[PDB]
């Protein structure tokens with residue numbers, strides 16, 4: 001009737017009567033709701049609706065908000081599609097010293113509007129089709145329709161008309177510098193170079209005026225890299241090849257660690273003989289990892305400047321990138337030079353900790369904390385305490401993973417519900433608009449997966465599908481489904497072309513979509529790798545490896561700019577806290593101080609956090625910048641996270657800071673995160689820093705032929721760590737020739 005059983009658990013299929021717990025706060029109450037009833041999609045778009053996309057505002061707003069199909073910005077309006085390009089004169093870098101914020105952004109302008117000869121009063125714009133990274137938007141007014149196909153990484157906008165023809169409208173007359181009849185090269189008054197393409201024989205009119213017109217029912221617009229007729233000619237070759245399908249297909253080669261992704265379009269010809277291909281604009285995270293076999297397709301001098309640095313052109317049907325998956329661990333092992341009794345004391349202190357709210361996020365942070373403590377308790381010989389922590393995880397998960405109470409009725413809180421309208425699992429109590437905007441399902445549910453993975457590491461029976469595994473697998477499907485999932489859209493959170501996850505379900509902002517904590521995304525991917533390995537689910541594991549590895553490539557470019565190529569020279573900080581489609585901010589979604597605008601991209605610390613140490617010069621540069629701004633090592637908040645980060649390159653410094661301040665205050669206090677951030681513990685902090693002191697630096701130059709491992713290097717001496725989730729012993733080969741044997745359900749070293 002009102003819930004569906006899944007193993008021992010269930011999810012609600014009717015919206016529950018929420019138990020507000022007597023809380024009257026309207027913000028809290030408004031969070032316990034559902035996403036919008038109205039979805040702006042045509043009847044060609046059926047099944048679970050895609051969310052968390054760069055283009056999402058088209059589906060939620062009657063028209064759209066401003067979007068960033070780089071290299072363009074566009075927005076839908078009743079009058080037509082506005083097109084813009086941020087030139088250098090449009091870009092700014094601003095600091096608000098009092099707020100401690102910085103902002104890199106452009107403008108919300110209009111270079112021209114793509115219009116329909118029959119109407120400038122469209123009723124709405126709907127999603128009419130989409131694929132892995134393009135969308136087809138359909139402006140509708142009865143018989144008058146204008147379908148616009150565009151995408152991130154497409155320097156084309158394809159325009160198809162019904163019951164009318166093409167118009168390009170400008171506020172100031174453009175310079176048409178090349179007039180080939182059906183093809184024109186033009187510039188805005190402020191020298192932005194574009195081109196427009198119609199079928200042969202359909203000639204452009206209005207040249208020299210503010211309005212360029214064409215009788216064709218098909219045109220394409222291109223952003224040109226330069227005012228160059230040879231480039232115009234190249235763009236003409238693919239201007240009639242409209243992208244209909246676009247897939248990012250991947251493989252993981254376990255032996256080598258290589259994740260290979262092939263981006264492939266399928267086009268429809270708008271003139272006879274049009275080739276099956278396009279011109280792609282690649283982002284830095286792509287072209288820096290371009291496969292050898294794709295290099296011949298590069299259009300070398302075809303560059304575009306955007307918020308994310310320089311894009312480059314590449315022609316054809318497909319291209320391929322190659323990345324290296326570095327491994328993850330379930331925990332750091334027991335290899336530190338800590339006082340073990342001191343660590344035991346901290347493990348017991350952590351029983352005083354409790355969740356600071358009833359919503360999925362705060363509960364998530366608490367269950368991640370317990371799951372992090374349990375392996376450390378095992379290591380220290382506090383085996384009943386470890387069991388206490390895992391028992392508490394079981395109690396919490398077995399509660400949340402059941403939608404019905406003892407009577408068989410729906411619960412009012414601590415449950416999951418399937419919103420059928422969009423096709424998404426929502427958890428109540430909700431927060432951060434996880435339900436009302438379909439936000440942050442990776443951030444929140446990643447913590448539930450961590451809890452499950454720690455349980456599964458000790459208890460395979462609990463994790464079976466028919467027990468509690470089916471419900472965990474349902475949560476994972478919500479945020480990272482494979483194709484043809486009957487309940488959920490494909491890879492909800494992830495944008496395979498932009499290379500990152502997008503946190504906002506709706507994307508109804510004029511900067512496009514955003515992501516703040518890239519580290520909470522990486523945490524989700526880590527935990528699925530661990531869960532899938534524990535439960536023997538190779539396909540799921542490999543999908544999470546692809547996500548972890550790809551997201552890592554985007555983080556190092558756009559959040560960290562490890563290569564010192566992307567952020568403008570005048571931008572002071574050494575991190576971007578929030579990446580948007582259209583802008584970059586050193587700022588947080590809540591009111592914070594200096595440390596948090598860095599550390600929200602570090603936390604939480606866990607066995608998959610070692611990607612943060614791959615670039616020791618970056619780690620040093622970022623730490624030194626934050627230290628400069630603070631003016632000392634008196635961290636304003638979350639001191640433990642700064643010490644843990646510092647330990648990637650200078651564990652002696654990290655240790656002395658920790659010794660000086662870690663016991664400044666006593667047991668868990670929600671009002672005071674000066675020393676210990678509320679998702680962290682003293683025990684975790686002390687264990688982490690001492691392990692890094694013994695291990696040295698992360699060594700990303702060595703891979704292995706199994707996925708659960710790490711390699712460190714201290715002055716040329718390597719330490720190899722492997723965790724084996726199997727009932728059988730394994731042998732692991734490392735790429736430097738080293739081999740080890742690992743016993744069932746253990747680390748090779750430091751089991752403790």
Ligand SMILES: OC[C@H]1O[C@@H](O[C@@H]2[C@@H](O)[C@H](O[C@@H]3[C@@H](O)[C@H](O[C@@H]4[C@@H](O)[C@H](O[C@@H]5[C@@H](O)[C@H](O)O[C@H](CO)[C@H]5O)O[C@H](CO)[C@H]4O)O[C@H](CO)[C@H]3O)O[C@H](CO)[C@H]2O)[C@H](O)[C@@H](O)[C@@H]1O
Nearest residue numbers: 361432433437439440443503504514516517520589590673
């Ligand atoms: O130390 C005491 C203080 O601790 C703070 O908790 C921190 C916590 O807020 C932080 O959360 C992260 C979230 O920012 C992030 O979630 C984002 C949403 O918050 C955001 O919502 C916006 C909304 O702010 C705005 O008003 O309206 C928008 C719609 O118009 C709406 O979208 O949306 C983002 C996506 O667009 C979304 O990602 O993600 C995670 C939570 O889901 C968190 O990473 O996390 C910190 C670290 O755990 C916390 O310390 C409290 O907030 C303060 O009140 C306390 O005083």
Ligand SMILES: OC[C@H]1O[C@@H](O[C@@H]2[C@@H](O)[C@H](O[C@@H]3[C@@H](O)[C@H](O[C@@H]4[C@@H](O)[C@H](O[C@@H]5[C@@H](O)[C@H](O)O[C@H](CO)[C@H]5O)O[C@H](CO)[C@H]4O)O[C@H](CO)[C@H]3O)O[C@H](CO)[C@H]2O)[C@H](O)[C@@H](O)[C@@H]1O
Nearest residue numbers: 065099101508509510511512578585587588589590591592
């Ligand atoms: O200082 C003490 C108080 O601090 C507060 O925290 C501050 C925090 O709220 C602030 O969050 C920033 C967001 O406000 C910002 O959101 C922007 C959107 O508002 C904007 O929306 C527009 C919409 O206004 C317009 O009508 O329609 C447009 C669509 O057509 C729509 O886009 O969208 C922007 C993106 O397009 C969006 O950025 O987003 C920032 C990140 O980019 C947030 O940082 O941040 C401050 C700095 O960290 C915080 O100080 C607390 O909440 C208070 O309780 C304290 O009293």
